[PDB]
Amino acid sequence: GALFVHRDTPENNPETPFDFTPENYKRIEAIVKNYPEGHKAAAVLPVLDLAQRQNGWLPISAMNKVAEILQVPPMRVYEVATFYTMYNRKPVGKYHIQVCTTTPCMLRNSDSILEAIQKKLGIKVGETTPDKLFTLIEVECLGACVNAPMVQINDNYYEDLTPKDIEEIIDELKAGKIPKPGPRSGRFSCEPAGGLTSLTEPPKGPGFGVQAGL
């Protein structure tokens, strides 16, 4: 699935109503100034991200709006939208769950994490629940390899999951709560699970080791 050619539909067409709220416009006014004058096209990615946050996905009307305000050919914004994968060109659930499945997360049995999430929601990969609350997709390495298995929901990393651990978060989400991020195993971060083995000593103060010449 996930075609790369747009077709007009009643709910997704260039006449769809989209426009940045004035508060967003102020934010854009500062994004464009991170780049040299005459190279205002560098704001395509952040501005497309900002639109997605406002709407949750990018209708065809949204992309054209980004093109109009940055003076960019409309096709040059369709290239960006289809290239990067965090741009949702179709509506997504309220919570986009993203189960990593690359080898490091596969070795630590992510399949059980994926299988557990399907069973709790009764949806196959790529699908959205009938209530439009959740969307589940497999993804590649998310950078939390040592904390495998793990998933991402919207903006947060939930790490060191086990079939029971993940199902709690879904229940917490389905109640309207904001589940705490970070690993659920008994550790906090990339530190060893079985007690520290390094930096178990107060950090040296300013000026330590400074050479004489300096």
Binding site: F4, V5, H6, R7, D8, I60, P73, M75, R76, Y78, E79, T82, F83
Partner: protein, 263 residues
């Protein structure tokens, strides 16, 4: 002078600084393979069919893009160079469809001709083939995009020559596609010219579809009268019947383009 001396198969040739390897070989009557390099467009370097070995080097460089350095012995026909073309030509034909009999380009296709001059005689590809869906871009240029080799000649021509940033690439990976992403017609006074630059049968003349084959047409070098520019053209006939119109290169008038009305 500022000319630098470089060797093509050992033969000395003097070139200006900033000349590319591919241009160095032309100076001595040697023509490197190519699909993405067009002398009248940007440099893309994304087909890798022009990879060439440089003597006393461990890597093969893209002749079209690489500027030449002083005293480079270019080995246009070494074993390493030959196996670079064979490898690349193997990847282009992996997913290409078996449309030569029903393809308008058949008989004047650069993929075909360069396959038989620089590629192997058979295939070791056992998997299934990619298939893309056609895209309508107007009543002139017919699109059968399963034959596109993602060379970007059309994208670079429309942006720079015709000045219409409406063609581009969407997706990524083996699924990357060339098109407009929406129902758009590429209607410009120079629209028909993307037919010629496309080295394969992905873009072909729609009015001319299925009417003739390249080998059975007689070429007559004549002039155009649809405007005052006097574009040089080649009129193709078959059994005393005009079949198509093609540009005839002239640097000082029309380069190698013609307008839709003429074409």
């Amino acid at each position: 002078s500022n000319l630098i001396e470089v060797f093509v198969d050992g033969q000395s040739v003097m070139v200006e600084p900033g000349t590319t390897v591919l241009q160095a070989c032309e100076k001595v009557g040697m023509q490197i393979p190519r699909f993405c390099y067009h002398e009248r467009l940007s440099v893309a370097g994304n087909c890798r069919m022009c990879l060439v070995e440089i003597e006393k080097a461990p890597k093969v460089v893209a002749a079209c893009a690489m500027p030449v350095m002083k005293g480079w012995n270019i080995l246009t026909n070494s074993e390493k160079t030959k196996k670079a073309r064979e490898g690349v030509m193997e990847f282009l034909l992996a997913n290409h469809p078996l449309d030569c009999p029903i393809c308008d380009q058949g008989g004047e296709c650069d993929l075909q001709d360069q396959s038989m001059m620089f590629g192997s005689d058979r295939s070791r590809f056992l998997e299934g083939k990619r298939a893309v869906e056609d895209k309508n871009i107007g009543p002139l240029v017919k699109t059968i995009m399963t034959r596109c080799i993602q060379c970007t000649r059309c994208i670079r021509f429309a942006s720079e020559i015709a000045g219409v940033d409406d063609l581009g690439t969407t997706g990524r990976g083996n699924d990357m596609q060339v098109g407009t992403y929406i129902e758009k017609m590429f209607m410009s006074e120079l629209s028909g010219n993307i037919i010629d630059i496309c080295p394969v049968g992905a873009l072909t003349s729609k009015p001319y579809a299925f009417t003739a084959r390249p080998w059975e047409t007689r070429k007559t070098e004549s002039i155009d009268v649809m405007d005052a520019v006097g574009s040089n053209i080649v009129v193709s006939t078959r059994t005393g019947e005009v079949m198509r119109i093609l540009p005839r290169m002239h640097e000082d008038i029309n380069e190698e383009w013609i307008s839709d009305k003429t074409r």
